């Protein structure tokens, strides 16, 4: 069973895509604060872009989920 | 005051709806190749051959199955081995 | 981009035709100025001048060798041919440098330009020198500044002044030499 | 027909019958009306646009021809003349053309800020007409000179 | 009372447009009322120019 | 005065007899007007695009079928099955 | 009943003010009206979960366990992980029962 | 500040661009703070300046 | 899984049959309903004060 | 509201804010100075705006403690 | 027939999800789904999306504008 | 003959006519030299008949996208974007329509070697715009479907309508992926719109024609 | 047995993915704090966002977890 | 059964380059929301901006796709 | 061993965190005394990352 | 084969060098984002700088893809 | 043959100091618009000294490139 070993040992190195993941939502939603904490008054558009930053961000996320469980089921 | 002139006018399609539905099944239908599970044989082989002889297992799965691969038919036996 | 060619040889030219001629025309805030801000020169090593302000005051116009501001990211020191800078000061000591001697200013707030030609030009409303302070208003102050807070945003904003002020006081007060 | 449904024509079918009836000459003065108060109020204002010179120089003949002075027509028909209406033509009938526009506006003493185009459609190009049509050009072009109250001016790209 | 008719016409067209329009106006009423002003339009539409 | 007669198919005042059809656009009666003024000279870029696309989607299904023909012809002339024997 | 009116008047019944956010008291412990509805939300899938799973329950998943077992089989084609033993454990056990 | 002061600095770029703006909001802000303390103290000097004369 | 399709060549034509269906009725059927509205209230909305003017100059009732 | 400097999001202008810092650090000078500086702390003056021409409503500061801390 | 086709549709998809070999998985995304469209219409605030894009339309984003009344009377 | 009597002010109506009027700001047109009046106005309109129609473009593409991208939401359905040949065709349709405006432009001819990169550069973005939209369209539903298949295990193994916390806090997780689900339903149908209009608005510039000829002061 | 050695391997490959999100944390919190001391009037806000960005962050961190309990148990 | 193992972990190995993706993606959307907090008055201009960056850092993801697709089904 | 490469980016985090303390701290030390409490947050908040990487440390070795 | 299953290791392990180039091009158009924050009035000369910086970096992007191709179809 | 396998395999992972070469040529990139977005006026000497910077740091995306081949055919 070298085959569905393998797919273990590549869908472990796959996954370590969504460190920079985690890092890029970190940086993003920490500028948030800042830029929240820089004028209140459009804090509530700042969310929104951070919403929009969190969706699009989130697509990097889950090519890299697709692309473990395309090696871990398919 | 125009508002019981539109209630008369009830629900109504799309004004180009049939053309879309025409189009996608003629896309559907008009393929040019067998119908994916299908093969096509020689008309002999298709009057020599019984129903169940001439259907597949993959294609009739089981509705609802409690085992996951239970299929309805079983298909031919006669199997080339 | 510069759609009004603007200054005071041009107000002194368009101006003879719209005026009676029997009116010399005004003088302006640059004829009373002698240092300028683009001009070459005027820093000579390690000195620079450092015109150091306050409506009621001039504290000092010489020439320094370091001037320790404090702006509002933090203590910065400005050196003879320093960048050009427009820097908002905190309530914080400017201390002029002029060898071993140090006299250290503490200003309630202002502005510091470092212009192109080195010239640093601070620019406060009151400075008070350290010795002249005494240590005994500045708590009852930081711990009644502390305490009255109102749903006015204007008195939010005065508070946070005389907090970050009378704070910044007993910084620059109980860390003394 | 015509003049009893002015309202439902459109300027590309009016263009059609006035250069059919600019050949057979056939007119009235409640047809020229009609035709003329369904080219400016009844269709719209940049259909003259979409027309072509060689047709709304036929429409200028057509109204000269009878003497027809329709200045809200006249200003509409201006319209439709421009460097791109008549870059669209050949030479022989961007000649024609322009020829024809010169004369039905200098007949009515109608000179529009878009006579310049057609002025300038034979000032950029003079080796296609005689001196006598260069002298019915620049005769136009003193006219419109002085009722646009400026001085022609030729210009080059840059 | 010479050019009356025209005046209220105007009036009365407007007034009724104005007090429907971008509630429950129909498209048909519009068209009716305002017969030439749908047929300059739909030469926008027709001739490419509906962002005029 | 003006009589009504100057008002005709110009002006109309909101109806009392009956509410009428809706006037149709000329590109909602015949296809032939729409496909030749603004489908054709319009978006015949796009049309275009889907063409190219047909095309080269064509070509790409071309190149599957050979692939499935190479290996099927090289199965077939070494004795082998194919395919995975179906599966049941 | 007309077949398009009356169901849809106790559809406007039901959805507008046959509320059940306090004709089943509710407010005493949840906090808001967004609070519930989100609750609302998971119940329905948890709901949801549970019925799909109830409705045919003697069954080999298709999805992957992770080496449980639902009741007392433990051994049985319920939890096998190859699927053509449990197939034919099925069809033993299926002429039994 | 913005209105007119920094539109009559700008020469092909600006005159005003050459300095490091150490403030902590934007330099429209810096500059319309700026503005005002110059009109204090213009006009400080303007009626002391007056008050001698 | 699902990844390839069976044919590429009619996934793609459902693709151009349905965006230019779509195309087609927005042009047709959506946008003469869209710019009739929405010209109606900008000519009256740009004209009004021009139409104005010159209804005031043509009427000879004050 | 307004997008700048917490002065300036309650409303503040920058000359009334440094003002206040100014006062506030002459309310806690050493009393041989803070007296002496109470001198340029004093606001006395009058104004009166003019809507027509010649008339107008009036008002009035004699502080002699400083710019007014709380709103205008 | 839009009934008729919807639920005819409906049924047909749901033969054929129950079918799948991912057949339990397919028919809780239903109800995955269904549960955010009766959390979509439960939450929406529907005045404010009518007058929200009523608002998208400078058509009836105000009123119009014409014929001020005093242009056109007869006296 | 007979079309459909239409409300004015209908939703529908205020919905597309705030799409088409923003996807129609995408590519302004371009403020001229000369002042816009009678002279100018065939150059207008001129101009206004050699720009591209990447508004409606935009939003048919817009339109037909989050349709499909919002069918994969209801229940009973998959995206129709979700296929690789539907979303991929899609871009590459969109890209050839770019690529077609801009070989019209010039003469229909194919235009060292930084270039040749430039080209590859400019001929993956026929992949990239298609396959944007699929791969986000098929991720979350493949860990849609990944995430319920471990969030039913649970209640399989253990009892239904007991120990339920362990199946609440991955009911929520669902919840929460089904709702990131249509964000990117709607965010991937502007993305690729917003990507239209610029790739086919790079080839939407024209020479303004312009007056010739004038008569000044 | 092979498969059960690699999932060992796979799993911790997998996990390697918090790296990132624990620095984006960091990254976040320290925002947090600098923008709390930038102004002081905002920080009971402030925390908020910290909060909705640590759980929109802390969804990788649980996808790379049911990535890791996927590897061990499919 | 090592060429259909070495692709596995071939692409568990290539698709790798989703970390940087979404690093770079987190902090060009942290820059949006810094860059709109500065002056919110061009906050159209400047989403425009991310959008077209957004489009081209993520062509990258979509080459790592492309290579992890042609390791796995080629 | 390869598991525990995680504790790389959380000991990053809490460096960049408690440094951006010290900067906030001398950008106004007056709320220094709320400032270490967002610190401690998100320290605690930062060891939730680090306690599941050692989660998974002794669940691939004693699990 | 050893030979063909290692190539695809190969350019697996090549084609991480796109996340340097993701990170790279994510931090270059958020400053351009940031620097078209502080004069929008320059700000086409700011994306054509941003787009000839793209373009002279992801020429890394497609270095490391063609020794991605290189490896595996040469 | 493990000498040919080994060779692609460490031509592999030989490219991945490109991705750094990629992050330096994005940093230095978005600091060329930040600089030029501070004044306008010097921006062409800037963009001199980012194609200095350029040239500069493609050494070391050459120097990779060099290894790579000569990994390969050396
Ligand atoms: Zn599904």
Redesign the pocket.
Same mark, same amino acid.
């Given at each position: 069973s070298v085959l569905a070993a393998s797919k273990m040992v590549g869908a472990g190195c796959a996954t370590i895509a969504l460190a920079g993941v985690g890092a890029g939502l970190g940086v993003m939603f920490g500028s948030l604060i800042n830029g929240a904490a820089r004028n209140p008054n459009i804090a509530k558009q700042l969310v929104g872009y951070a919403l929009l930053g969190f969706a699009l961000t989130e697509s990097i996320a889950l090519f890299s989920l697709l692309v473990v469980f395309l090696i871990l089921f398919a | 005051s125009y508002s019981a002139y539109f209630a008369k006018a009830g629900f109504q399609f799309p004004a180009g709806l049939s053309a879309l539905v025409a189009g996608i099944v003629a896309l559907n239908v008009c393929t040019g190749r067998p119908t994916k599970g299908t093969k096509e044989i020689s008309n002999a082989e298709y009057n020599a051959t019984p129903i169940g002889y001439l259907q597949s297992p993959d294609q009739h799965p089981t509705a609802f199955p409690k085992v996951p691969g239970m299929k309805d038919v079983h298909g031919s036996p006669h199997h080339h081995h | 981009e510069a759609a009004a060619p603007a200054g005071p040889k041009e107000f002194t030219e368009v101006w003879n035709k719209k005026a009676p001629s029997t009116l010399i025309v005004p003088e302006f805030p640059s004829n009373y100025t002698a240092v300028k801000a683009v001009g070459e020169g005027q820093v000579h090593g390690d000195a620079f001048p450092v015109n150091f302000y306050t409506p009621h005051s001039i504290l000092s116009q010489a020439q320094k060798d370091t001037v320790v501001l404090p702006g509002v990211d933090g203590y910065f020191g400005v050196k003879a041919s320093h960048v050009p800078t427009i820097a908002q000061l905190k309530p914080g000591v400017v201390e002029l440098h002029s060898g071993a001697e140090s006299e250290k200013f503490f200003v309630s707030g202002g502005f510091a330009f470092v212009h192109p030609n080195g010239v640093t030009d601070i620019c406060v409303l009151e400075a008070a020198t350290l010795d002249q302070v005494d240590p005994a208003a500045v708590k009852s102050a930081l711990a009644a500044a502390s305490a009255a807070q109102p749903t006015d945003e204007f008195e939010q904003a005065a508070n946070r002044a005389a907090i970050e002020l009378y704070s910044a006081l007993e910084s620059a007060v109980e860390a003394k030499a | 027909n015509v003049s009893a449904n002015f309202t439902k024509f459109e300027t590309e079918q009016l263009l059609q019958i006035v250069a059919t009836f600019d050949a057979f000459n056939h007119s009235s003065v409640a047809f020229l009306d009609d035709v003329a108060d369904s080219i400016t109020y009844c269709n719209h204002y940049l259909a003259p646009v979409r027309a072509g010179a060689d047709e709304l120089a036929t429409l200028l003949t057509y109204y000269a021809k009878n003497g027809h002075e329709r200045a809200d027509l006249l200003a509409t028909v201006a319209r439709g003349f421009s460097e791109v209406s008549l870059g669209k033509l050949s030479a022989a009938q961007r000649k024609d053309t322009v020829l024809s526009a010169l004369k039905a506006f200098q007949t009515f003493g109608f000179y529009p800020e878009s006579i310049e185009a057609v002025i300038g459609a034979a000032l950029v190009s003079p080796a296609e007409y005689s001196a006598e049509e260069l002298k019915e050009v620049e005769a136009v072009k003193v006219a419109a000179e002085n009722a646009l109250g400026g001085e022609f001016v030729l210009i080059q790209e840059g | 009372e010479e050019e009356e008719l025209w005046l209220l016409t105007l009036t009365q067209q407007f007034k009724h447009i104005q007090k429907h329009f971008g509630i429950d106006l129909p498209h048909s009423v519009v068209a009716h009322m305002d017969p030439l002003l749908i047929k300059k339009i739909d030469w926008e539409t027709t001739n490419a120019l509906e962002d005029f | 005065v003006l009589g009504e007669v100057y008002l005709k198919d110009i002006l109309r005042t909101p109806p009392t007899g009956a509410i009428p059809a809706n006037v149709p656009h000329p590109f909602q009666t015949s296809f032939y007007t729409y496909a030749t003024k603004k489908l054709i000279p319009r978006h015949w870029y796009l049309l275009g695009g889907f063409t190219f696309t047909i095309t080269l989607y064509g070509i790409l299904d071309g190149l599957r079928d050979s692939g499935k023909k190479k290996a099927y012809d090289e199965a077939i002339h070494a004795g082998k099955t194919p395919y995975t024997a179906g599966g049941h | 009943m007309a077949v398009t009116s009356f169901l849809g008047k106790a559809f406007e019944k039901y959805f507008y003010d046959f509320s059940a956010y306090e004709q089943f008291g509710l407010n005493r412990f949840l906090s808001s009206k967004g609070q519930y509805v989100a609750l609302r939300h998971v119940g329905f899938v948890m709901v949801g979960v549970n019925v799909l799973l109830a409705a045919n329950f003697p069954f080999n998943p298709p999805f992957p366990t992770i080496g449980m077992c639902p009741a007392g089989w433990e051994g049985t084609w319920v939890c096998q992980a190859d699927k053509a033993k449990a197939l034919e454990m099925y069809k033993e056990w299926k002429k039994s029962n | 500040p913005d209105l007119l002061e920094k539109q009559l600095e700008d020469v092909t770029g600006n005159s005003l661009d050459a300095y490091d703006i150490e403030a902590s909001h934007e330099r429209s802000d810096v500059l319309r703070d700026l503005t005002e303390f110059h009109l204090g103290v213009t006009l400080y000097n303007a009626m002391l300046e007056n008050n001698c004369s | 899984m699902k990844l390839l399709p069976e044919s590429l060549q009619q996934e793609a034509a459902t693709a151009a049959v349905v965006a230019s269906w779509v195309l087609w009725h927005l042009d047709t059927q959506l946008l003469p309903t869209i710019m009739r509205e929405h010209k109606l209230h900008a000519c009256w909305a740009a004209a009004a004060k021009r139409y104005n003017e010159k209804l005031f100059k043509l009427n000879p009732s004050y | 509201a307004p997008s700048g400097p917490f002065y300036r999001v309650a409303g503040m202008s920058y000359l009334r804010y440094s003002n206040i810092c100014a006062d506030l650090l002459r309310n806690v000078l050493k009393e041989p100075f803070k007296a002496k500086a109470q001198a340029r702390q004093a606001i006395h003056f009058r104004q009166a705006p003019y809507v027509d021409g010649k008339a107008g409503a009036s008002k009035v500061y004699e502080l002699e403690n400083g710019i007014p801390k709380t709103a205008n | 027939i839009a009934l008729f086709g919807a639920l005819s549709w409906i049924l047909y998809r749901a033969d054929g999800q129950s079918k799948a070999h991912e057949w339990i998985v397919?028919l809780n995304?239903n109800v995955l789904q269904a549960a955010w469209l009766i959390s979509f219409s439960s939450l929406i605030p529907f005045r404010a999306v009518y007058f929200a894009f009523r608002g998208m339309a400078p058509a009836t984003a105000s009123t119009l504008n014409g014929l001020k009344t005093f242009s056109s009377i007869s006296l | 003959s007979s079309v459909r009597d239409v409300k004015t002010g209908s939703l529908p109506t205020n919905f597309l006519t705030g799409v088409y009027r923003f996807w129609r700001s995408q590519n302004p047109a371009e403020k001229p030299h000369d002042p816009v009046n009678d002279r100018l106005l065939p150059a207008v309109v001129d101009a206004s008949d050699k720009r591209a129609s990447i508004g409606t473009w935009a939003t048919t593409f817009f339109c037909t996208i989050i349709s499909c991208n919002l069918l994969g939401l209801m229940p009973f359905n998959?995206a129709p974007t979700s296929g690789l040949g539907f979303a991929t065709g899609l871009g590459v349709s969109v890209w050839a329509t770019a690529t077609i405006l801009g070989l019209s432009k010039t003469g229909f001819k194919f235009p060292f070697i930084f270039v040749p990169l430039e080209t590859i550069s400019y001929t993956f973005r026929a992949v990239s715009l298609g396959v944007r939209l699929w791969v986000n369209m098929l991720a979350g #539903?493949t860990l849609l #479907?990944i995430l319920t298949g471990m969030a039913l295990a649970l209640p399989f193994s253990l009892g239904f309508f007991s120990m339920v916390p362990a199946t609440f806090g991955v009911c929520c997780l669902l919840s929460a992926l089904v709702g990131l689900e249509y964000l990117v339903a709607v965010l991937q149908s502007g993305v690729f719109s917003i990507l239209s209009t610029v790739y086919v608005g790079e080839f939407n510039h024209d020479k303004f024609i312009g007056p010739a000829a004038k008569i000044v002061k």
């Open positions: - | - | - | - | - | - | - | - | - | - | 397919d995304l | 998959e #539903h #479907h």
